[PDB]
């Protein structure tokens, strides 16, 4: 018995991997302001960022 097969296929695959540690990257949009009497030079504010 002689037999001959010729299969041909096409695969698809869509993947998604995530870092539970670094799951997104934050980017703020801020506006400084001064209310007092004196001009400040080389302004450097420290910024507490609270979620809950």
């Amino acid at each position: 018995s002689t037999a001959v097969q010729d299969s041909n296929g096409e695969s698809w695959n869509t993947g998604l991997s995530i870092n539970k540690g670094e799951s997104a990257y934050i980017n703020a949009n801020v506006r400084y302001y001064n209310t007092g009497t004196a001009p400040m030079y080389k302004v450097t504010p420290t910024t507490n960022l609270v979620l809950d």
């Binding site: 870092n19 539970k20 540690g21 670094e22």
Partner: protein
């Protein structure tokens, strides 16, 4: 017989006169009360970010 009796960086005149960093509490103007910061840190929350 000492520049600074209390031992802190401020001399007896400085403490007595009250002519230093005025934010210092007033009792530290006594040349025997050490003008001396005592700083501890308090915990309020802890964040566990699993990687």
């Amino acid at each position: 017989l000492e520049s600074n009796t209390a031992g802190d960086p401020y001399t007896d005149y400085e403490k007595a006169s009250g002519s230093f960093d005025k934010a210092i509490k007033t009792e530290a103007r006594d040349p025997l009360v050490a003008a001396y910061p005592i700083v501890g840190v308090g915990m309020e929350k802890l964040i566990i970010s699993t990687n």
